[PDB]
Amino acid sequence: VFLGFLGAAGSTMGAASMTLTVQARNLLSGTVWGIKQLQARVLAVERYLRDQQLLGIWGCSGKLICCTNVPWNSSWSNRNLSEIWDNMTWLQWDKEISNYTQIIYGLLEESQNQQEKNEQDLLALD
Amino acid sequence: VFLGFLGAAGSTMGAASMTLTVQARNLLSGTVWGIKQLQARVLAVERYLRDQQLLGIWGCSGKLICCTNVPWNSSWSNRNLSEIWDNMTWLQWDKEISNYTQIIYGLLEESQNQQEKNEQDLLALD
Amino acid sequence: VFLGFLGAAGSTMGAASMTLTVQARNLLSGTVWGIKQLQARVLAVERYLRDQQLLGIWGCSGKLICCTNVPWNSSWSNRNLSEIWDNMTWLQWDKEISNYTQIIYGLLEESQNQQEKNEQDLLALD
Amino acid sequence: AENLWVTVYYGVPVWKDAETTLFCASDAKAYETEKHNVWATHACVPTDPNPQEIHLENVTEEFNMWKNNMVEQMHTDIISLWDQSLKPCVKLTPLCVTLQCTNVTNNITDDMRGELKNCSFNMTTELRDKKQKVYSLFYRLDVVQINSNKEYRLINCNTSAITQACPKVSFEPIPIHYCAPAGFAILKCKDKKFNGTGPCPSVSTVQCTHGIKPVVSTQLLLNGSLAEEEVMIRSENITNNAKNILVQFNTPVQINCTRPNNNTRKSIRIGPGQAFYATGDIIGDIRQAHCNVSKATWNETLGKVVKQLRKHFGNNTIIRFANSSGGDLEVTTHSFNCGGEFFYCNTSGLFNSTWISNNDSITLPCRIKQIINMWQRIGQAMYAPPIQGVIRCVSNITGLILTRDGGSTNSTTETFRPGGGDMRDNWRSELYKYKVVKIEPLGVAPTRCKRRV
Amino acid sequence: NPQEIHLENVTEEFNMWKNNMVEQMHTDIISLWDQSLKPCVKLTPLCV
Amino acid sequence: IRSENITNNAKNILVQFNTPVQINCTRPNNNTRKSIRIGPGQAFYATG
Ligand SMILES: *[C@@H]1O[C@H](CO)[C@@H](O[C@@H]2O[C@H](CO)[C@@H](O[C@@H]3O[C@H](CO[C@H]4O[C@H](CO)[C@@H](O)[C@H](O[C@H]5O[C@H](CO)[C@@H](O)[C@H](O)[C@@H]5O)[C@@H]4O)[C@@H](O)[C@H](O[C@H]4O[C@H](CO)[C@@H](O)[C@H](O)[C@@H]4O[C@H]4O[C@H](CO)[C@@H](O)[C@H](O)[C@@H]4O[C@H]4O[C@H](CO)[C@@H](O)[C@H](O)[C@@H]4O)[C@@H]3O)[C@H](O)[C@H]2NC(C)=O)[C@H](O)[C@H]1NC(C)=O
Ligand SMILES: *[C@@H]1O[C@H](CO)[C@@H](O[C@@H]2O[C@H](CO)[C@@H](O[C@@H]3O[C@H](CO[C@H]4O[C@H](CO)[C@@H](O)[C@H](O[C@H]5O[C@H](CO)[C@@H](O)[C@H](O)[C@@H]5O[C@H]5O[C@H](CO)[C@@H](O)[C@H](O)[C@@H]5O)[C@@H]4O)[C@@H](O)[C@H](O[C@H]4O[C@H](CO)[C@@H](O)[C@H](O)[C@@H]4O[C@H]4O[C@H](CO)[C@@H](O)[C@H](O)[C@@H]4O)[C@@H]3O)[C@H](O)[C@H]2NC(C)=O)[C@H](O)[C@H]1NC(C)=O
Ligand SMILES: *[C@@H]1O[C@H](CO)[C@@H](O[C@@H]2O[C@H](CO)[C@@H](O[C@@H]3O[C@H](CO[C@H]4O[C@H](CO)[C@@H](O)[C@H](O[C@H]5O[C@H](CO)[C@@H](O)[C@H](O)[C@@H]5O)[C@@H]4O)[C@@H](O)[C@H](O[C@H]4O[C@H](CO)[C@@H](O)[C@H](O)[C@@H]4O[C@H]4O[C@H](CO)[C@@H](O)[C@H](O)[C@@H]4O)[C@@H]3O)[C@H](O)[C@H]2NC(C)=O)[C@H](O)[C@H]1NC(C)=O
Ligand SMILES: *[C@@H]1O[C@H](CO)[C@@H](O[C@@H]2O[C@H](CO)[C@@H](O[C@@H]3O[C@H](CO[C@H]4O[C@H](CO)[C@@H](O)[C@H](O)[C@@H]4O)[C@@H](O)[C@H](O[C@H]4O[C@H](CO)[C@@H](O)[C@H](O)[C@@H]4O[C@H]4O[C@H](CO)[C@@H](O)[C@H](O)[C@@H]4O)[C@@H]3O)[C@H](O)[C@H]2NC(C)=O)[C@H](O)[C@H]1NC(C)=O
Ligand SMILES: *[C@@H]1O[C@H](CO)[C@@H](O[C@@H]2O[C@H](CO)[C@@H](O[C@@H]3O[C@H](CO[C@H]4O[C@H](CO)[C@@H](O)[C@H](O)[C@@H]4O)[C@@H](O)[C@H](O[C@H]4O[C@H](CO)[C@@H](O)[C@H](O)[C@@H]4O[C@H]4O[C@H](CO)[C@@H](O)[C@H](O)[C@@H]4O)[C@@H]3O)[C@H](O)[C@H]2NC(C)=O)[C@H](O)[C@H]1NC(C)=O
Ligand SMILES: *[C@@H]1O[C@H](CO)[C@@H](O[C@@H]2O[C@H](CO)[C@@H](O[C@@H]3O[C@H](CO[C@H]4O[C@H](CO)[C@@H](O)[C@H](O)[C@@H]4O)[C@@H](O)[C@H](O[C@H]4O[C@H](CO)[C@@H](O)[C@H](O)[C@@H]4O)[C@@H]3O)[C@H](O)[C@H]2NC(C)=O)[C@H](O)[C@H]1NC(C)=O
Ligand SMILES: *[C@@H]1O[C@H](CO)[C@@H](O[C@@H]2O[C@H](CO)[C@@H](O[C@@H]3O[C@H](CO[C@H]4O[C@H](CO)[C@@H](O)[C@H](O)[C@@H]4O)[C@@H](O)[C@H](O[C@H]4O[C@H](CO)[C@@H](O)[C@H](O)[C@@H]4O)[C@@H]3O)[C@H](O)[C@H]2NC(C)=O)[C@H](O)[C@H]1NC(C)=O
Ligand SMILES: *[C@@H]1O[C@H](CO)[C@@H](O[C@@H]2O[C@H](CO)[C@@H](O)[C@H](O)[C@H]2NC(C)=O)[C@H](O)[C@H]1NC(C)=O
Ligand SMILES: *[C@@H]1O[C@H](CO)[C@@H](O)[C@H](O)[C@H]1NC(C)=O
Ligand SMILES: *[C@@H]1O[C@H](CO)[C@@H](O)[C@H](O)[C@H]1NC(C)=O
Numbered sequence: 001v002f003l004g005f006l007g008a009a010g011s012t013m014g015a016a017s018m019t020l021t022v023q024a025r026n027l028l029s030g031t032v033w034g035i036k037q038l039q040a041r042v043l044a045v046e047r048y049l050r051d052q053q054l055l056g057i058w059g060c061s062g063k064l065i066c067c068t069n070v071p072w073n074s075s076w077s078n079r080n081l082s083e084i085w086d087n088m089t090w091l092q093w094d095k096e097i098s099n100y101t102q103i104i105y106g107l108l109e110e111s112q113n114q115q116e117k118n119e120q121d122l123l124a125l126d
Numbered sequence: 127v128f129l130g131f132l133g134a135a136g137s138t139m140g141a142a143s144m145t146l147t148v149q150a151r152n153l154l155s156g157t158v159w160g161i162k163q164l165q166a167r168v169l170a171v172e173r174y175l176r177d178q179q180l181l182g183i184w185g186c187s188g189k190l191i192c193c194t195n196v197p198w199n200s201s202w203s204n205r206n207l208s209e210i211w212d213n214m215t216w217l218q219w220d221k222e223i224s225n226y227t228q229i230i231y232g233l234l235e236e237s238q239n240q241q242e243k244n245e246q247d248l249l250a251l252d
Numbered sequence: 253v254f255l256g257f258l259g260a261a262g263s264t265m266g267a268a269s270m271t272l273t274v275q276a277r278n279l280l281s282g283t284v285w286g287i288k289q290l291q292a293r294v295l296a297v298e299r300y301l302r303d304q305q306l307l308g309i310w311g312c313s314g315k316l317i318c319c320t321n322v323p324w325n326s327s328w329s330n331r332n333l334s335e336i337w338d339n340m341t342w343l344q345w346d347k348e349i350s351n352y353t354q355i356i357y358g359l360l361e362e363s364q365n366q367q368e369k370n371e372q373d374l375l376a377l378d
Numbered sequence: 379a380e381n382l383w384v385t386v387y388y389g390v391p392v393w394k395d396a397e398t399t400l401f402c403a404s405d406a407k408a409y410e411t412e413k414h415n416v417w418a419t420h421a422c423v424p425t426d427p428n429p430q431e432i433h434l435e436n437v438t439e440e441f442n443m444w445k446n447n448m449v450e451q452m453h454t455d456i457i458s459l460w461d462q463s464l465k466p467c468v469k470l471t472p473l474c475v476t477l478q479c480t481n482v483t484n485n486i487t488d489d490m491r492g493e494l495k496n497c498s499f500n501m502t503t504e505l506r507d508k509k510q511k512v513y514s515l516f517y518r519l520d521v522v523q524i525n526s527n528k529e530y531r532l533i534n535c536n537t538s539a540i541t542q543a544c545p546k547v548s549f550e551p552i553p554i555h556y557c558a559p560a561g562f563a564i565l566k567c568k569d570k571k572f573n574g575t576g577p578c579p580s581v582s583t584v585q586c587t588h589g590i591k592p593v594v595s596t597q598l599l600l601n602g603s604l605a606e607e608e609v610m611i612r613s614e615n616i617t618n619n620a621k622n623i624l625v626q627f628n629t630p631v632q633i634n635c636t637r638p639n640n641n642t643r644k645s646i647r648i649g650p651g652q653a654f655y656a657t658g659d660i661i662g663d664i665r666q667a668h669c670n671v672s673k674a675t676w677n678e679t680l681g682k683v684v685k686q687l688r689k690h691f692g693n694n695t696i697i698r699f700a701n702s703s704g705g706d707l708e709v710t711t712h713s714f715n716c717g718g719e720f721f722y723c724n725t726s727g728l729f730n731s732t733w734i735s736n737n738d739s740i741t742l743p744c745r746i747k748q749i750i751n752m753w754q755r756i757g758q759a760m761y762a763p764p765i766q767g768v769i770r771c772v773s774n775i776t777g778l779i780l781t782r783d784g785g786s787t788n789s790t791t792e793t794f795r796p797g798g799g800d801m802r803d804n805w806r807s808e809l810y811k812y813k814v815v816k817i818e819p820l821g822v823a824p825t826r827c828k829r830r831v
Numbered sequence: 832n833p834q835e836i837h838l839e840n841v842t843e844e845f846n847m848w849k850n851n852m853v854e855q856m857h858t859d860i861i862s863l864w865d866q867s868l869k870p871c872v873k874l875t876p877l878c879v
Numbered sequence: 880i881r882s883e884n885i886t887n888n889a890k891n892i893l894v895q896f897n898t899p900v901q902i903n904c905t906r907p908n909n910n911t912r913k914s915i916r917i918g919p920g921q922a923f924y925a926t927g
């Protein structure tokens with residue numbers, strides 16, 4: 001079924017993790033007024049690129065869902081699988097992990113370059 | 127051989143599918159006049175990103191040629207392989223499939239997220 | 253250890269090839285003054301995209317380190333491995349290979365599309 | 379293995395020298411200044427609460443402050459910024475009129491000329507129908523004898539037009555930071571003995587410059603950042619007399635300045651909306667504008683420049699100091715703003731010395747103008763409104779813009795004189811630490827590696 | 832063909848007295864209006 | 880000889896030559912200019 005942009009707001013993080021390509025979709029394309037238009041037109045690509053920037057300095061240029069090699073520090077959440085994917089919503093979930101998102105991102109940054117520096121060595125010997 | 131940007135305009139879709147990296151190349155880098163320059167400079171990245179947007183919400187961030195899992199509805203064209211790749215040109219070909227390009231894109235959108243939601247399950251069990 | 257943005261300036265190309273994700277990081281996010289801000293805000297995404305443009309028309313959207321199929325013309329440098337990775341710095345190294353970087357890029361451009369045009373044939377037969 | 383393959387690198391630490399549009403940064407207290415006064419502090423982005431400048435170890439960089447852009451950019455930003463401010467501010471078109479002026483009420487000795495002319499004139503009214511004879515006070519420099527009546531005119535009337543600065547604005551120099559765009563760095567020579575040109579061993583990248591406030595002043599430059607060890611004397615070509623010398627002090631020499639007269643301001647309705655701020659009665663004594671510096675410290679600091687100068691002209695050399703040769707009031711005198719009015723202080727007393735190989739203060743008089751023609755103005759001028767009350771400012775002297783006499787003859791007596799003229803020198807004086815570069819992260823180099831099939 | 836997607840199962844804390852887009856609008860209206868009067872003729876001498 | 884609608888007289892005809900036909904033009908009078916100070920800054924250039 002097709003709900004709409006942001007339609008799975010109050011949906012469980014499992015059901016909301018279905019409709020990802022819809023929120024990712026309506027995110028780019030869509031003299032007084034003339035200037036408003038221009039610093040809104042750049043703001044949208046700046047804000048968009050800053051996310052692709054992250055996905056790219058991780059390994060997740062795929063993208064949508066992307067697994068990684070940094071293990072989940074229980075201190076961050078510690079909740080069980082069911083009670084976040086089949087229970088909580090992303091609006092809710094965001095505020096819990098909010099305290100360490102940038103610290104989590106740092107774990108990701110080092111881990112990706114570590115992968116690359118390694119994979120060169122594999123293709124080097126083989 | 128090297129024809130030039132758009133040189134394979136009147137070339138067959140097979141021969142034109144060789145020189146893809148040339149059209150993809152000359153596509154980014156290249157107070158009255160000052161404003162003209164600015165809303166042309168943003169227009170070019172907006173228009174460019176909107177294509178990368180599509181390739182990314184499909185699986186084709188590669189890119190150039192990218193195969194997929196949505197099968198060709200004969201209603202769209204129904205022509206044989208030879209008579210489009212070794213015959214028709216993209217200028218011509220575009221106008222035939224033009225009636226359903228956005229409907230075709232929708233088939234692609236769901237298919238990619240479907241791949242991701244699946245591939246997580248593989249790495250999950252293994 | 254963590255040096256800082258550009259910290260491995262006078263470091264060997266091996267040690268500088270560790271901290272790549274730091275220079276790649278601080279590269280996007282960070283009425284007289286108002287106009288200055290705007291043509292600096294676009295300049296940064298134009299300049300950034302022009303690099304992603306290259307990585308993408310090669311196979312290296314990964315990215316950071318990316319191997320390829322164009323072999324090293326000794327005429328370009330001819331130095332041994334040790335004396336560039338465990339010796340020279342990128343500031344230094346850049347000025348040597350500077351004379352042919354755009355010629356080298358051209359070798360890359362054809363090589364990628366050549367890969368794609370080939371890989372379709374593999375998935376075609378299989 | 380012998381066969382090498384190029385593998386591309388993204389995020390490589392390397393830069394090419396550049397030019398680009400930078401942008402300004404200021405702090406929250408600048409907006410707390412409110413009163414609609416500071417220029418461009420509002421459109422200006424903020425600073426960083428925790429600024430970081432990453433030192434780059436093992437790298438040297440060839441600086442040149444005499445072939446920089448961000449001082450030309452700054453100089454320009456300052457002229458524009460200023461000129462955009464005057465658009466709303468009222469035009470003094472009808473003030474250009476045949477004045478009928480006398481001297482101010484005073485009993486001074488004949489030798490002492492009258493510098494305050496009480497001028498009455500037919501001014502315009504809120505209504506086109508009428509007129510109004512009204513009086514104001516003008517400095518001798520703001521008027522010219524036109525021609526048994528003693529009648530005058532505002533000096534701009536034949537050169538340029540005139541526009542009264544809004545009193546709801548401020549001339550205070552507040553610190554500006556020049557921040558780079560993304561993928562652009564600013565490199566900072568942290569060497570504490572650098573003359574501004576050549577390889578710098580100690581270098582650091584940084585987003586924004588330091589707080590560079592735009593003090594526009596001739597002769598001595600004020601309130602600037604000072605050197606860490608020695609009094610550095612910098613120039614493009616020292617041997618050539620045509621090029622000026624930028625002296626950067628090591629110790630601050632505090633110079634107190636003032637307008638002793640308790641001046642008063644009345645407002646005249648040009649109408650409608652237009653309103654000229656005349657100079658009203660002088661409450662109290664009629665005294666003279668001036669500045670004081672310690673004769674002790676000036677002695678001390680002028681001794682420091684000489685110790686440095688002999689490193690360029692010989693150990694057995696005489697280096698005396700002389701006053702200006704001659705030119706415009708803009709350059710023949712230490713010019714500055716102080717409390718909102720413009721000063722012109724005679725520097726003869728400071729540059730009047732002699733130096734061999736081996737407890738009061740310096741009272742130095744000043745003049746004051748209201749219709750000013752800064753930055754080599756040609757078609758436009760600006761009337762700086764009377765600032766009510768008594769005015770005094772306290773400032774450090776950070777440097778000098780000295781000039782040597784080219785007569786030479788290989789004499790060990792080459793003297794120096796204070797200069798000015800081009801105002802890029804002032805920003806040149808603060809921006810010597812900085813350089814702007816274009817970041818290029820796409821490295822390509824061979825390592826024994828082929829990509830898969 | 833305008834579309835407003837209803838978001839089911841979600842609540843949101845509104846406050847109209849601490850909004851911006853009315854301050855933005857108020858401003859847009861004042862500016863817009865004031866830019867219109869630049870070409871329009873000045874009645875300077877009508878003050879008589 | 881190019882036009883939008885040649886048959887219709889209301890539309891003009893754009894003739895594009897093949898050969899250049901050089902046409903020399905001149906004002907033979909050695910005119911003089913004096914400058915009149917409107918003041919201040921304003922200055923009208925009269926014909927002397
Ligand atoms: C703001 O705007 C104000 C308004 O515009 C302005 O105030 C005006 O200022 C002018 C100049 O200062 C004043 O003009 C002078 O007025 C003197 C006063 O006389 C008045 O009152 C007399 C009664 O006491 C009347 O008799 C007299 O009118 C009579 O005389 C006329 C003469 O032609 C005649 O046509 C009339 O019909 C009538 O009969 C007037 O109403 C007046 O005395 C003066 O004349 C001479 O004397 C002056 C000193 O008092 C001299 O300064 C002046 O130069 C005159 O001498 C002339 O004659 C000499 C002998 O021939 C010559 O050698 C001189 O060079 C000079 O010649 C010049 O002047 C002639 C004028 O008569 C002229 O015709 C010549 O061609 C030559 O150019 C003079 O008229 C005026 O009164 C003021 N008005 C007001 C309302 O106050 C003010 O200045 C502006 N600025 C400011 C800051 O406020
Ligand atoms: C080199 O650098 C030096 C050092 O900075 C420069 O010296 C500066 O010179 C300036 C003049 O050129 C000078 O600015 C003027 O100061 C006047 C003196 O009063 C101020 O300063 C005293 C202390 O000296 C301060 O006590 C006053 O008020 C304090 O308290 C009130 C609340 O009661 C606060 O609102 C205020 O911010 C200030 O707070 C201080 O105290 C609290 C504790 O109580 C602390 O916690 C704070 O941190 C802070 O320290 C005054 O602030 C002053 O009279 C002048 O004011 C006029 O101009 C300003 C321009 O911004 C304007 O806002 C005013 O309203 C006023 O203009 C209007 O009003 C007039 C009549 O009122 C009218 O006639 C005018 O036309 C206008 O309409 C002005 O602020 C500055 O103080 C000094 N620097 C220092 C540190 O003192 C030197 O100039 C430089 N060299 C060169 C060449 O530039
Ligand atoms: C450019 O301008 C700057 C400033 O704008 C000038 O720099 C200033 O220079 C002056 C001197 O020239 C400096 O003043 C000094 O202050 C000293 C400290 O005084 C404070 O502490 C004492 C306790 O030790 C307090 O008692 C004082 O308060 C009392 O005084 C004030 C008035 O001053 C009253 O209002 C109070 O109610 C109090 O009554 C201060 O808080 C001070 O020591 C020093 O000299 C004093 O002492 C000597 C003896 O050693 C006396 O001969 C002299 O007369 C002074 O006596 C005062 O202090 C005693 C107590 O010590 C009292 O009992 C007296 O009644 C008298 O008040 C001197 O006064 C000032 O600090 C300094 N400011 C700055 C910012 O640098 C520059 O010179 C100038 N430069 C140029 C080139 O022009
Ligand atoms: C920037 O600053 C400089 C330096 O301050 C300044 O240069 C000086 O300009 C002034 C003019 O503005 C020069 O004029 C001097 O004015 C004083 C004041 O006059 C009083 O005293 C005399 C009598 O001395 C009275 O007649 C008069 O009415 C005033 O009361 C004069 O005193 C100076 O005259 C001296 O020289 C004359 C000629 O030699 C002597 O006849 C006279 O007695 C004065 O004494 C000098 O000579 C004596 C021997 O005869 C000797 O014993 C004395 O010690 C002394 O040397 C003079 O007319 C002044 O000279 C300039 N200063 C210098 C050093 O040249 C700049 O003008 C200023 N910038 C600008 C743009 O103005
Ligand atoms: C820059 O700063 C300087 C200070 O560093 C300041 O200089 C001051 O200048 C004034 C003059 O305007 C000095 O006042 C006097 O100047 C005379 C000048 O005499 C010369 O010229 C005469 C001809 O006019 C010659 O005959 C003579 O030989 C000189 O060449 C001085 O002569 C005065 O000094 C005499 O008295 C002193 C005290 O007793 C003696 O110690 C000294 O040796 C001098 O005596 C000599 O001359 C006598 C005849 O006059 C003779 O009989 C004796 O035998 C002996 O030979 C006096 O100095 C003033 O002093 C200067 N200041 C200082 C601190 O010296 C500038 O004004 C200043 N400029 C600016 C623009 O700020
Ligand atoms: C700081 O500034 C000083 C000068 O103030 C510089 O010092 C000079 O340096 C130059 C060399 O760099 C010395 O050499 C002289 O060059 C002159 C060149 O002028 C000729 O060429 C130009 C080209 O456009 C012509 O327009 C011009 O008319 C001249 O024809 C020569 O003219 C000098 O004289 C020689 O030529 C003449 C004939 O023309 C002969 O008669 C002479 O004998 C002699 O052979 C001379 O060659 C110059 O002498 C230096 N001058 C001083 C005062 O030192 C510094 O270089 C500068 N510092 C830096 C770092 O740049
Ligand atoms: C270059 O320009 C010329 C004209 O200058 C064009 O030539 C004309 O071409 C048209 C057809 O394209 C010929 O046909 C005529 O059309 C008229 C249409 O007008 C009616 O419809 C409009 C619609 O808004 C009404 O407003 C208007 O009042 C009319 O009712 C007809 O009126 C003509 O007459 C016919 O109708 C009347 C009744 O109304 C009958 O009495 C007549 O007998 C007849 O049946 C006619 O049909 C027209 O004749 C051409 N004119 C000329 C001078 O050649 C070219 O086409 C153009 N070139 C290009 C490339 O466009
Ligand atoms: C008003 O000031 C003027 C100067 O602006 C005085 O006239 C001059 O006085 C000086 C004094 O040294 C003399 O050198 C000049 O020669 C005087 N000018 C002329 C033309 O002689 C004037 O005396 C002052 N008083 C009045 C009432 O005007
Ligand atoms: C992460 O988990 C470990 C144990 O699994 C714990 O010791 C550590 O404190 C946690 N991290 C934080 C930031 O608390
Ligand atoms: C797609 O093909 C099927 C049969 O292969 C046909 O029934 C269907 O109508 C086609 N799609 C459209 C839109 O016609």
Ligand SMILES: *[C@@H]1O[C@H](CO)[C@@H](O)[C@H](O)[C@H]1NC(C)=O
Nearest residue numbers: 323324325326327328352355
């Ligand atoms: C590349 O190397 C070959 C031999 O390996 C050499 O002949 C050729 O000249 C080189 N390329 C250039 C541009 O010199």
Ligand SMILES: *[C@@H]1O[C@H](CO)[C@@H](O)[C@H](O)[C@H]1NC(C)=O
Nearest residue numbers: 674677678730731732733734
């Ligand atoms: C510097 O100060 C000393 C202190 O006595 C003084 O004698 C000397 O004259 C001063 N220097 C000069 C050049 O006058």
Ligand SMILES: *[C@@H]1O[C@H](CO)[C@@H](O)[C@H](O)[C@H]1NC(C)=O
Nearest residue numbers: 687688689690691692693694
């Ligand atoms: C001048 O002489 C002093 C004497 O102590 C010496 O230290 C200095 O290096 C000399 N400078 C030059 C330029 O000769």
